[PDB]
């Protein structure tokens, strides 16, 4: 079998294949996560270079791993499917053996572990994907939001963004997100998430996707018109 | 290109030497061994204020009598920790006893040189392994990706290590109390860290014979930081 | 330019490692010749023992593959013995599986196929040898089949191999143009060996003693090599007319 | 030891070219000309027996090969590569078809199997592509007579008539002027001999030309009588004398 | 160029340069020889005394295979040991299936094919030794010499290592002056002389002589080391000839 | 050893791109153009054969349009031999699903499976990727008529109208101009042929240079029919739409 | 375990399963639920060898839940039953086969029809208006053959089921400690808590 | 140069550079001495610390009751090779009820090291070993190189500055070989030998490591205050 | 049919005192009604102040004692010459025995 060490150290102590995988993430469409007091919102950018697209059937950017946890990503689309499938299988395996659904931290730790493994195994390249994993632990009302990257490191975030122009939207979030008082309602959280994407997106039309996750497996994706109403209200307050 | 297991003209393995450079870029970790216990402390180094810092886990329990702190590519440490935990538990299963701290360290270090064309590269992380056993008392070890491990009275690893080690050279003596060691780790971490040290960007832990391995609360560490500030202002 | 190191195509559709294996074939500086009689097939080869410390009885490039099949090799002795051992193993296995002696042309095809694989698979190098197989086949009669590092093979009325193969080939061509038959019209193998040695002397322009030659003879149901004294008797008969 | 070449030796270059396949096609271009023509009641395939030495017995080297009783093959390019492909093609006709369905494969499907083998030598680890192009002629009950070309990439195409190798460009133009959908087998053989004469330098006779047909069933070549449904092979290699007879009416 | 960077690659000459480089390691080694006598074979080797701290007679170089074959080599000593280990496996499997001890020509090809196999791939390195070996079987005495390429022939006398040219010349004199043959006891004496004479190419350090033999009359066709009085007698004969 | 000759087919560039995937896409841009158009009452697949000959046996020839099952077909752009390897795997996957669940495989599940196979060759194994892009035309009872595309990276997307192969930039602009949501199959047939007629590198678009297929519920009642057009039928539809 | 029954009426499928678990000499439990929900509108009851029953049922449940998440879609009862049949047909030629018999009761939301499938440990599948495993059918089928109508209400189905259980309690030698009854219809799965 | 990329490549002069580079790792290692009489065999080793807070790296490893070694170079490689020796000593005792001869132990170490010098993918061992033992033919001392070369000696030294100790032993050869039935005097000779390799630093109580095996003496290692008697 | 087991007889006895312990056994070895040996030691000093006897099928008994003595040796190698305590030895012997759960050592062991 093909055993070639593709991920190796360089004289300055860098693993370039892992670092180049991060450059693939930089190219991917922007993804953002914001947790309120009783919810988490995942926002995603859709590049409008592709019209004549069939939006009914085209792969959506946010994926349910279980009924209570969701995963979004920035980077190689094909690579992300492999991580999503593995995470979904592990979620069902956990329910089968522990008789309890995965915690958000456990699912994050698993996906991050798979990513790390692909950085020191022979004959494989690292995933060109960073992920945002959000949801609620079983029988818990505390919001959870984690981030993973190609190297396999992971951490928890009050709010975070990944992908192209994520430096700009992180700038916005760092001055607009208060830890002592997070977005108290679904409305406030969605509004802050749409606002953060409007710093980068272009037209607020079919370019912004929004998914809201609440406790006890309550997950819903907002439609074009619902998001369009947030887009309308934000700019009418801005004209002042 | 060239083999992953190649020797340099000086008789050193290229990949091992390069992984040591990655560890130099890692956040600082410090350990101090006393006759009352061993203290372990780390710099958390969050990349952004929106990152919830209590999710940064650079100090980890291996068993009740053995703790561990890391510096470098911290994702690489996860399989090393998994192996260490498995080895500690397996020995207890086979022998109805605690494993020696040195034996645990040796088992972790056996993984290090298992790379080639086994894993595709060495680990990019260094570990400080601290613990207690009945035969050799309180112990602190430094485990490297070369497979070598040294025992230390005190040791610092990561980006601020050589400045910290010089400081540990002057401060350590064989009569240090546990309280004195805690303040000493805080003092030296504060010296080498970029950002100002507080209970949210630094973490303390210890291992004692009585209570075992414990990660300190942010409230407990905050008091020790206040105690440090006052005694430095006392002269 | 790693297309020259392993067996992959060059921009001209050539395999350089195969071409260089053909060049290794002439490293021993030895010439061989094969001809067919009515009842036999004869192969002769030059024998050179350049060191006095050598045991001359062990210096040989003719091999007894099976009872019926003989093989002469042009190329270095390590690769020659590699091919010899494999041919012996293949011939023995064939007899075990199919219940009859492996034909000369079938063994040639099998060794040619193995050689073809070395030209297509990168991890294996070509053998730097040309193999001339001889026998008196029970269906086809006297047979000469020759294999090379490209995996090519074909039957021959007669053939020659080595640094001076062209001189011997043309000499043989001219004889068969006169006689207008595909073989040496002679009853005994002794006279077919004499024909073979005579025409090698003519083509190379050199005289031979008993220790300068190596001879293999195939008849119905056996292949054998001649001793120095058997060759001497052959040389005496050539000189006496 | 162990084969440590587990990686592809054929890869895409910046321009999108697969170098090793292009170079294999170059080797085919240097090869001796071979052709095929399809008639209403048969198919003919032909090539030159380019003898490497006059001491060599060129009858022992078969450029036109029977794959099944109703399918034959000819090539241009590297001879040894062709020989092993004929071995693999003969075996796969049995292992992946005859041992399953109790009958020989139709021409198009055997071609498909040979094509797959050639494709894999273009992607699998530690190997180079085959340096040959094949022309495969055959007949089967439901598809009738057919003729196919297979290239080093593994691509294959059906033809009414075509040529490959050395003088293929000129030969294909010659075939375009002469071919029609009303040709009888004897007419196709006549055209094949006319076309092949243009690319041959030296001797042009039954001993230097190799020619075979896919035509009527030959009960005389079956080897047994008694089963009405078994009527014999449609593949037949023409003799040296049969070729020379048609060279007088040339 | 680049043809010499990888084993099994043919150069435009039709040469395997990696094998030719292995020969250089052989030529760098100490001198070892072999002499075929009337009813057996004698092997001798030069052992360089690098220091006084080397224990005399302890670091034995000549190796036995089965009970009737002796092996000596020049070049990389570990490579030679690896080849003898394989030879011992080949001899054991032959005797297991066929009962009779492996004939010397049969044993020669087993070593030959194994060494040749290490010239077929780039994933292995050629052997850095030339091996002189032989013994007595049912057809009499046999002496062989095997090169890094896998090439081997039978010999009347053989030599390899740094002082091979000197040794070869001495061996050629013995072949000419004794067409009828040499006795086993004579061959031991002559072997001692030739090693002492060949030591001129290694004259900086002093050396230790080591001799072994297999003879039908003297050792019952078994391989034995020359020891004690017979060794001293050969050393005295050798010292007398150099003065 | 062997490392010397390894091209390393599964590595990132400094910009975070996959060399071999990018180069395979370059190869596909020279292949004959294939077009898919989805209508309310069916799907059209139209594709151009590459510079042909008069001696090519067209009526038995297939290089562009392939049947995966009774409900799903594909149009190919790239290496035909590479495509047939993947096509046979897809045919097997469809039958595996039918055996397991006793229902025809949904279109997207088949598409995802083939796309994952393509992905694997870009991440592990050290082999070259498949130089193929597919247009999938299919029907199932969940989403109805569907069009997808996949490329050597293993990425796939859904479309109302799409092109692959040569001159996709020009083709996509022409499709984007004339496509409407309430369009019917007979209108889509015309659009596909008109688009090929304008984007082709040949002098004129004739029957012998085309492969054509429709997937219609124009099958008597509650079922779907695949129609791979014959040479004479391509000739007739060219006259009907007024191109010849 | 022991008795499992099923009946498909106009608008629902009803599954009845015994509560007893007996380990040789003693009845260890009298409240055991011999069923697993595979999807919101599909229920599977089971009986056979100890351990293998729950292991097989939970394995199937895990697989259907995995499919549901992957596709965001509920498989039809027919599709689920075919998947289960193949797993048992595979198992019967294994080193150690699953000794498990199942009934699958599902409501098809596409066709708006209840469906009942009976599958034994060999992988023998049949679609039925009513079914059973073991000796349960020997006592109950004559009653079902007489009274069953395809247009029965859920309440009428429960009443016919009560008559079947009463006949079992009369003529069966083993005490199966009553049955747990569950209904599968357009609104999902619910348990009848008084039976 | 162009021929040092892997162990499977000879240079044009017939050298193996990867093996030579592995030999270089031994020269960087701390000094260790070996010497023997007719009754006893002794190892003396200068241990190296990382700094003043650190421990001194152990140099001597026990392989059996009658055999053990000292190391210089890559310590993990010594652990692999000493583990192999422990297994081979153990196999000999379990299967044949026989203590493994020191000479045979040397042959086994040679062959294990050789395989890593002729194959692709692998690397040579980066450590040198001094093996002492007492078997059926008396006291023995062996020197192991990762080239595969194993040599039996009266005395020797490996590591940095080992040449000074080696010359001293070459002078004292006739004296220390005669120290029979006196373990303390043989160790004294070894401590005096290793002293000829010291610069700037001297032998302290946590610096010095001594091992001994003999006629009625199991292989035992002395560290700490147990070597103060010899300082 | 081949029977891999046998019975070598013998009787052993272990008694624990306040600050001492004894392990005793008879020295007779038998098969069926024959005496193999009148003195064949059955109780063994295994090092670290531990004594052991595995009574029953003597081949399995010798194998187990041999493997435990070996385990003591490797415990010293792997754990810095730490003394193997009696409780640790007992747990270790359980794993030696259960490793052949489906082809057992036909013995009754006492330490
Ligand atoms: Cl073959």
UniProtKB/Swiss-Prot annotation, chain B:
Q: Which InterPro entries match?
A: Ntn_hydrolases_N, Proteasome_alpha, Proteasome_alpha-type, Proteasome_alpha_type_5, Proteasome_asu_N, Proteasome_sua/b
Sorted alphabetically, the Gene Ontology cellular component annotations on this record are: nucleus; proteasome complex; proteasome core complex, alpha-subunit complex; proteasome storage granule
The domain of life is Eukaryota
An example GO biological process term is:
proteasome-mediated ubiquitin-dependent protein catabolic process
Q: Which residues carry this modification: Phosphothreonine?
A: 47
Q: Which residues form the signal peptide?
A: none
Query: Where Phosphoserine occurs along the chain?
Result: 48
Entry-linked PROSITE patterns: PROTEASOME_ALPHA_1, PROTEASOME_ALPHA_2
Cite a single Pfam family from the UniProt record: Proteasome_A_N
Q: List the disulfide bonds.
A: none
Where does it reside? Cytoplasm; Nucleus
Q: Which SMART domains match?
A: Proteasome_A_N
Question: Keyword annotations for this protein?
Answer: Cytoplasm, Nucleus, Phosphoprotein, Proteasome
The text of the family note is: Belongs to the peptidase T1A family.
Q: Which PANTHER family match?
A: PROTEASOME SUBUNIT ALPHA/BETA
Q: What does this protein do?
A: The proteasome degrades poly-ubiquitinated proteins in the cytoplasm and in the nucleus. It is essential for the regulated turnover of proteins and for the removal of misfolded proteins. The proteasome is a multicatalytic proteinase complex that is characterized by its ability to cleave peptides with Arg, Phe, Tyr, Leu, and Glu adjacent to the leaving group at neutral or slightly basic pH. It has an ATP-dependent proteolytic activity.
Further comment: Present with 17100 molecules/cell in log phase SD medium.
Write down what this protein is called. Proteasome subunit alpha type-5
Q: Which organism is it from?
A: Saccharomyces cerevisiae (strain ATCC 204508 / S288c) (Baker's yeast)
- Provide the gene name from the record: PUP2
UniProtKB/Swiss-Prot annotation, chain C:
Q: Which Pfam families match?
A: Proteasome, Proteasome_A_N
What Gene Ontology cellular-component terms does the record carry? mitochondrion; nucleus; proteasome complex; proteasome core complex, alpha-subunit complex
Keyword annotations for this protein?
Answer: Acetylation, Cytoplasm, Isopeptide bond, Nucleus, Phosphoprotein, Proteasome, Ubl conjugation
Q: Is Cytoplasm found in the keyword set?
A: yes
A single GO BP: proteasome-mediated ubiquitin-dependent protein catabolic process
Tell me the residues on which Phosphoserine occurs.
227
Note the InterPro entries from the entry. Answer: Ntn_hydrolases_N, Proteasome_alpha, Proteasome_alpha-type, Proteasome_asu_N, Proteasome_sua/b, Proteasome_subunit_alpha6
Domain of life of the organism in this record? Eukaryota
Matches recorded under PROSITE patterns:
PROTEASOME_ALPHA_1, PROTEASOME_ALPHA_2
Localization in the cell: Cytoplasm; Nucleus
Sequence position, cross-link Glycyl lysine isopeptide (Lys-Gly) (interchain with G-Cter in ubiquitin): 222
The record's comment on protein family reads: Belongs to the peptidase T1A family.
Additional comments on file? Present with 15200 molecules/cell in log phase SD medium.
Q: What does this protein do?
A: The proteasome degrades poly-ubiquitinated proteins in the cytoplasm and in the nucleus. It is essential for the regulated turnover of proteins and for the removal of misfolded proteins. The proteasome is a multicatalytic proteinase complex that is characterized by its ability to cleave peptides with Arg, Phe, Tyr, Leu, and Glu adjacent to the leaving group at neutral or slightly basic pH. It has an ATP-dependent proteolytic activity.
How is this protein named in the record?
Answer: Proteasome subunit alpha type-1
Which species is the source of this protein?
Saccharomyces cerevisiae (strain ATCC 204508 / S288c) (Baker's yeast)
Gene name, Swiss-Prot/TrEMBL: SCL1
UniProtKB/Swiss-Prot annotation, chain D:
Cite the entry's keywords alphabetically.
Answer: Cytoplasm, Isopeptide bond, Nucleus, Proteasome, Ubl conjugation
The record's section on InterPro entries has: Ntn_hydrolases_N (IPR029055), Proteasome_alpha (IPR050115), Proteasome_alpha-type (IPR023332), Proteasome_asu_N (IPR000426), Proteasome_sua/b (IPR001353)
Keyword Glycoprotein attributed: no
Q: Which Pfam families does the entry mention?
A: Proteasome, Proteasome_A_N
Cellular localization per UniProt: Cytoplasm; Nucleus
Cross-link Glycyl lysine isopeptide (Lys-Gly) (interchain with G-Cter in ubiquitin) residue location(s): 108
A GO biological process of this protein is: proteasome-mediated ubiquitin-dependent protein catabolic process
SMART domains from the entry? Proteasome_A_N
Please state what the protein is called: Proteasome subunit alpha type-2
* Species per Swiss-Prot/TrEMBL record: Saccharomyces cerevisiae (strain ATCC 204508 / S288c)
Taxonomic lineage from the root: Eukaryota, Fungi, Dikarya, Ascomycota, Saccharomycotina
UniProtKB/Swiss-Prot annotation, chain G:
Question: Listed disulfide bonds for this chain?
Answer: none
Q: Name one GO molecular function term.
A: endopeptidase activator activity
Q: Where in the cell is it found?
A: Cytoplasm; Nucleus
InterPro entries according to UniProt: Ntn_hydrolases_N (IPR029055), Proteasome_beta2 (IPR035206), Proteasome_bsu_CS (IPR016050), Proteasome_sua/b (IPR001353), Proteasome_suB-type (IPR023333)
One annotated Gene Ontology cellular component of this protein? nucleus
As a miscellaneous remark, the entry gives: Present with 21800 molecules/cell in log phase SD medium.
Annotated function: Non-catalytic component of the proteasome which degrades poly-ubiquitinated proteins in the cytoplasm and in the nucleus. It is essential for the regulated turnover of proteins and for the removal of misfolded proteins. The proteasome is a multicatalytic proteinase complex that is characterized by its ability to cleave peptides with Arg, Phe, Tyr, Leu, and Glu adjacent to the leaving group at neutral or slightly basic pH. It has an ATP-dependent proteolytic activity. This subunit has a chymotrypsin-like activity.
Q: Which family does it belong to?
A: Belongs to the peptidase T1B family.
Supply the name of the protein: Proteasome subunit beta type-4
Q: What is the lineage of its organism?
A: Eukaryota, Fungi, Dikarya, Ascomycota, Saccharomycotina
Gene name, per UniProt, is: PRE1
């Amino acid at each position: 079998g093909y055993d070639r060490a593709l991920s190796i150290f360089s004289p300055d102590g860098h693993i370039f294949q892992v670092e180049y995988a991060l450059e693939a993430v930089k190219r991917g469409t922007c993804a953002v996560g914001v947790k309120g007091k009783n919810c988490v919102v995942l926002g995603c950018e859709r590049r409008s270079t592709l019209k004549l697209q069939d939006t009914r059937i085209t792969p959506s950017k946010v994926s349910k791993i279980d009924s209570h946890v969701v995963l979004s990503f920035s980077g190689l689309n094909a690579d992300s499917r492999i991580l999503i499938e593995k995470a979904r299988v592990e979620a069902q395996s956990h329910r089968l053996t522990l008789e309890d659904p995965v915690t958000v931290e456990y699912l994050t730790r698993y996906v991050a572990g798979v990513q790390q493994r692909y950085t020191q195994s022979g004959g494989v390249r690292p995933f060109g994907v960073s992920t945002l994993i959000a949801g609620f632990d079983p029988r818990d009302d505390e919001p959870k939001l984690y981030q993973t990257e190609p190297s396999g490191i992971y951490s928890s975030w009050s709010a975070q963004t990944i992908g192209r122009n994520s430096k700009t939207v992180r700038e916005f979030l760092e001055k607009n997100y208060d830890r002592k008082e997070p977005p108290a309602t679904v409305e406030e959280c969605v509004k802050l998430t749409v606002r953060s994407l409007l710093e980068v997106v272009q037209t607020g039309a079919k370019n912004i996707e929004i998914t809201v996750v609440k406790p006890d497996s309550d997950i819903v994706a907002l439609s074009s018109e619902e998001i369009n109403q947030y887009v309308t209200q934000i700019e009418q307050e801005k004209q002042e | 290109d060239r083999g992953v297991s190649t020797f340099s003209p000086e008789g050193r393995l290229f990949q091992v030497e390069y992984s040591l450079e990655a560890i130099k870029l890692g956040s600082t970790a410090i350990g101090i061994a006393t006759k009352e216990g061993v203290v372990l402390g780390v710099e958390k180094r969050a990349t952004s204020p929106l990152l919830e810092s209590d999710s940064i886990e650079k100090i980890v329990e291996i068993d009740r009598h053995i703790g561990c702190a890391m510096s470098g590519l911290t994702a690489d440490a996860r399989s090393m920790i998994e192996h260490a935990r498995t080895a500690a538990v397996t020995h207890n299963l086979y022998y109805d006893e605690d494993i020696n701290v040195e034996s645990l360290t040796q088992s972790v270090c056996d993984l290090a040189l298992r790379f080639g064309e086994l894993m595709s590269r060495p680990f990019g992380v260094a570990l400080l392994i601290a613990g207690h056993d009945a035969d050799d008392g309180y112990q602190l070890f430094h485990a490297e990706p070369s497979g070598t491990f040294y025992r230390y009275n005190a040791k610092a690893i990561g980006s601020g290590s050589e400045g910290a080690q010089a400081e540990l050279l002057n401060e350590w003596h064989s009569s240090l109390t546990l309280k004195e060691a805690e303040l000493l780790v805080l003092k030296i971490l504060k010296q080498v860290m970029e950002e100002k040290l507080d209970e949210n960007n630094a973490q303390l832990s210890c291992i004692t014979k009585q209570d075992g391995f414990k990660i300190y609360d942010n409230e407990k560490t905050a008091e020790l930081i206040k105690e440090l500030k006052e005694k430095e202002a006392a002269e | 330019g790693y297309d020259r190191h392993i067996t992959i195509f060059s921009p001209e559709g050539r395999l350089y490692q195969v071409e260089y294996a053909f060049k290794a074939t002439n490293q021993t500086n030895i010439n061989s010749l094969a001809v067919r009689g009515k009842d036999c097939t004869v192969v002769i080869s030059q024998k050179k023992v350049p060191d006095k410390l050598l045991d001359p009885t062990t210096v040989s490039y003719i091999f007894c593959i099976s009872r019926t099949i003989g093989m002469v090799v042009n190329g270095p002795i390590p690769d020659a013995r590699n091919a010899a051992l494999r041919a012996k193993a293949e011939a023995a296995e064939f007899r075990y599986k199919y219940g009859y002696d492996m034909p000369c042309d079938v063994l040639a095809k099998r060794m040619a196929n193995l050689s073809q694989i070395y030209t297509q698979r990168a991890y294996m190098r070509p053998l730097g040898v040309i193999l001339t197989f001889v026998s008196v086949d029970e269906e086809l009669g006297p047979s000469i089949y020759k294999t090379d590092p490209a995996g090519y093979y074909v039957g021959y009325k007669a053939t020659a191999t080595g640094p001076k193969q062209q001189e011997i080939t043309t000499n043989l061509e001219n004889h068969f143009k006169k006689s207008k038959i595909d073989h040496i019209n002679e009853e005994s193998w002794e006279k077919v060996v004499e024909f073979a040695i005579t025409h090698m002397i003519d083509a190379l322009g050199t005289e031979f003693s008993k220790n300068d030659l190596e001879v293999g003879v195939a008849t119905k149901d056996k292949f054998f090599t001649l001793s120095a004294e058997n060759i001497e008797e052959r040389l005496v008969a050539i000189a006496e007319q | 030891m162990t084969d440590r070449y587990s990686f592809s030796l054929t890869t895409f270059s910046p321009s999108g070219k697969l170098g090793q396949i292009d170079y294999a096609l170059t080797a085919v271009k240097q090869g001796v000309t071979s052709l095929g023509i399809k008639a209403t009641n048969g198919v003919v395939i032909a090539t030159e027996k380019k003898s490497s030495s006059p001491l060599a017995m060129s009858e022992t080297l078969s450029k036109v090969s029977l794959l099944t009783p109703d399918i034959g093959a000819v090539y241009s390019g590297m001879g040894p590569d062709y020989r092993v492909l004929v071995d693999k093609s003969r075996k796969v006709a049995h292992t992946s078809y005859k041992r399953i369905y109790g009958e020989y494969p139709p021409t198009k499907l055997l071609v498909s199997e040979v094509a797959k083998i050639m494709q894999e030598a273009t992607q699998s680890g530690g190997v180079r592509p085959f340096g040959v192009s094949l022309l495969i002629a055959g007949h089967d009950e439901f598809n009738g007579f057919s003729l196919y070309q297979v290239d080093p990439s593994g691509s294959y195409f059906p033809w009414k008539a075509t040529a490959i190798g050395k003088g293929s460009v000129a030969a294909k133009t010659f075939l375009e002027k002469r071919w029609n959908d009303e040709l009888e087998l004897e007419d196709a053989i006549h055209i094949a001999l006319l076309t092949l004469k243009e690319s041959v330098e030296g001797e042009f006779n039954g001993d230097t030309i190799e020619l075979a047909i896919i035509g009527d069933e030959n009960p005389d070549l079956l080897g047994y009588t008694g089963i009405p449904t078994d009527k014999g092979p449609r593949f037949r290699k023409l003799t040296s004398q049969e070729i020379n007879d048609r060279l007088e009416a040339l | 160029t680049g043809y010499d960077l990888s084993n099994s690659v043919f150069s435009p000459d039709g040469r395997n340069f990696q094998v030719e480089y292995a020969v250089k390691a052989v030529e760098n080694g100490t001198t070892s020889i072999g002499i075929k006598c009337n009813d057996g074979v004698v092997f001798a080797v030069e052992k360089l005394i690098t220091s006084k701290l080397l224990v005399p007679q302890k670091n034995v170089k000549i190796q036995v295979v089965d009970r009737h074959i002796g092996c000596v080599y020049s070049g990389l000593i570990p490579d030679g040991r690896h080849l003898v280990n394989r030879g011992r496996e080949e001899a054991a499997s032959f005797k297991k299936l066929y009962k009779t001890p492996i004939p010397i020509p049969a044993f020669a090809d087993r070593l030959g094919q194994y060494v040749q196999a290490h010239t077929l791939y780039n994933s292995v390195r050629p052997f850095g030794v030339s091996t002189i070996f032989g013994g007595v079987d049912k057809n009499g005495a046999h002496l062989y010499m095997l090169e890094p390429s896998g090439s081997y022939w039978g010999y009347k006398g053989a030599a390899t290592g740094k002082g091979r040219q000197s040794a070869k010349a001495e061996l050629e004199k013995l072949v000419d002056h004794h067409p009828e043959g040499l006795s086993a006891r004579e061959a031991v004496k002559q072997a001692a002389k030739i090693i002492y004479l060949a030591h001129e190419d290694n004259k900086e350090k002093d050396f230790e002589l080591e001799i072994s033999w297999c003879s039908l009359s003297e050792t019952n066709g078994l391989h034995k080391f020359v020891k004690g009085d017979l060794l001293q007698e050969a050393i005295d004969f050798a010292q007398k000839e150099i003065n | 050893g062997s490392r010397r000759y390894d091209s390393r087919t599964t590595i990132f560039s400094p910009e975070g791109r996959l060399y071999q995937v990018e180069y395979a896409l370059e190869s596909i841009s020279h292949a004959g153009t294939a077009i898919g158009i989805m209508a309310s009452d069916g799907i059209v697949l139209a594709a151009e054969r590459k510079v042909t000959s008069t001696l090519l046996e067209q009526d038995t020839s297939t290089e562009k349009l392939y049947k995966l099952n009774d409900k799903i077909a594909v149009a190919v752009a790239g290496l035909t031999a590479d495509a047939e390897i993947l096509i046979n795997t897809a045919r097997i996957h469809a039958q595996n699903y039918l055996k397991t669940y006793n229902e025809d495989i949904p279109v997207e599940i088949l598409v995802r499976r083939l796309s994952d196979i393509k992905q694997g060759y870009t991440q592990h194994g050290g082999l070259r990727p498949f130089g193929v892009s597919f247009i999938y035309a299919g029907y199932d009872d969940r989403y109805g008529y569907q069009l997808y595309t996949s490329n050597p990276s293993g990425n796939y997307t859904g479309w109302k109208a799409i092109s692959v192969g040569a001159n996709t930039s020009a083709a996509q602009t022409l499709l984007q101009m004339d496509y409407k949501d309430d369009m019917k199959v007979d209108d889509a047939i015309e659009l596909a042929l008109k688009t090929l007629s304008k984007t082709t590198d040949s002098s004129a678009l004739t029957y012998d240079r085309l492969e054509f297929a429709t997937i219609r519920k124009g099958a008597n009642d509650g079922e779907v029919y695949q129609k791979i057009f014959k040479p004479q039928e391509i000739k007739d539809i060219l006259v009907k739409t007024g191109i010849t | 375990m022991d008795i499992i029954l099923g009946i498909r009426v106009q608008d629902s499928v009803i599954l009845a399963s015994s509560k007893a678990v007996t380990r040789g000499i003693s009845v260890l439990k009298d409240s055991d639920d011999k069923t697993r929900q595979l999807s919101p509108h599909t229920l599977m009851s089971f009986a056979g060898e100890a351990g293998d029953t729950v292991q097989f049922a939970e394995y199937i449940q895990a697989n259907i839940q995995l499919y549901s998440i992957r596709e965001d879609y509920e498989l039809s009862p027919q599709a689920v039953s075919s998947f289960v049949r193949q797993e048992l047909a595979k198992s019967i030629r294994s080193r150690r086969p699953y000794q498990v018999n199942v009934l699958i009761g599902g409501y098809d939301k596409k066709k708006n029809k209840p469906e009942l499938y009976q599958i034994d440990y060999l992988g023998t599948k049949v679609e039925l208006p009513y079914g059973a495993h073991g000796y349960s059918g020997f006592y109950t089928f004559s009653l079902l053959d007489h009274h069953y109508r395809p247009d029965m209400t859920t309440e009428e189905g429960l009443d016919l089921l009560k008559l079947c259980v009463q006949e079992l309690e009369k003529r069966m030698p083993m005490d199966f400690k009553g049955v747990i009854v569950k209904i599968v219809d357009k609104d999902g799965i619910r348990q009848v808590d008084d039976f | 140069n162009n021929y040092d990329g892997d162990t499977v490549t000879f240079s044009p002069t017939g050298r193996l550079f990867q093996v030579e580079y592995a030999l270089e790792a031994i020269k960087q290692g701390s000094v260790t001495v070996g010497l023997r009489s007719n009754t006893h065999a002794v190892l003396v080793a200068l241990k190296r610390n990382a700094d003043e807070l650190s421990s001194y790296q152990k140099k001597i490893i026990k392989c059996d009751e009658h055999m053990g070694l000292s190391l210089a170079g890559l310590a993990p490689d010594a652990r692999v090779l000493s583990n192999y020796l422990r297994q081979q000593c153990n196999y000999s005792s379990l299967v044949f009820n026989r203590k493994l001869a020191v000479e045979r132990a040397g042959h086994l170490l040679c062959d294990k090291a050789q395989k890593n010098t002729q194959s692709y993918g692998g690397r040579p061992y980066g450590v040198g070993l001094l093996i002492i033992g007492y078997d059926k033919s008396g006291a023995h001392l062996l020197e192991f190189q990762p080239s595969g070369n194993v040599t039996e000696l009266y005395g020797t030294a490996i590591g940095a500055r080992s040449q000074g100790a080696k010359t001293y032993l070459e002078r004292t050869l006739d004296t220390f070989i005669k120290i029979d039935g006196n373990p303390d005097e043989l160790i004294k000779a070894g401590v005096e030998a290793i002293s000829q390799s010291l610069r700037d630093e001297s032998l302290t109580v946590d610096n010095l490591s001594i091992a001994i095996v003999g006629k009625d003496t199991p292989f035992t290692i002395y560290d700490g205050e147990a070597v103060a008697k010899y300082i | 049919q081949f029977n891999p087991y046998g019975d070598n007889g013998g009787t052993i006895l272990g008694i624990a005192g306040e600050d001492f312990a004894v392990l005793a056994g008879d020295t007779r070895n038998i098969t069926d009604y024959s005496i193999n040996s009148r003195y064949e030691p059955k109780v063994f000093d295994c090092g670290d102040n531990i004594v052991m006897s595995a009574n029953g099928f003597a081949a399995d008994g010798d194998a187990l004692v041999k493997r435990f003595k070996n385990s003591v040796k490797w415990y010293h190698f792997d754990h810095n010459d730490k003394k193997l305590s009696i409780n640790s030895a007992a747990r270790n012997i359980q794993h030696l025995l259960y490793g052949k759960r489906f082809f057992p050592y036909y013995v009754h062991t006492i330490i």
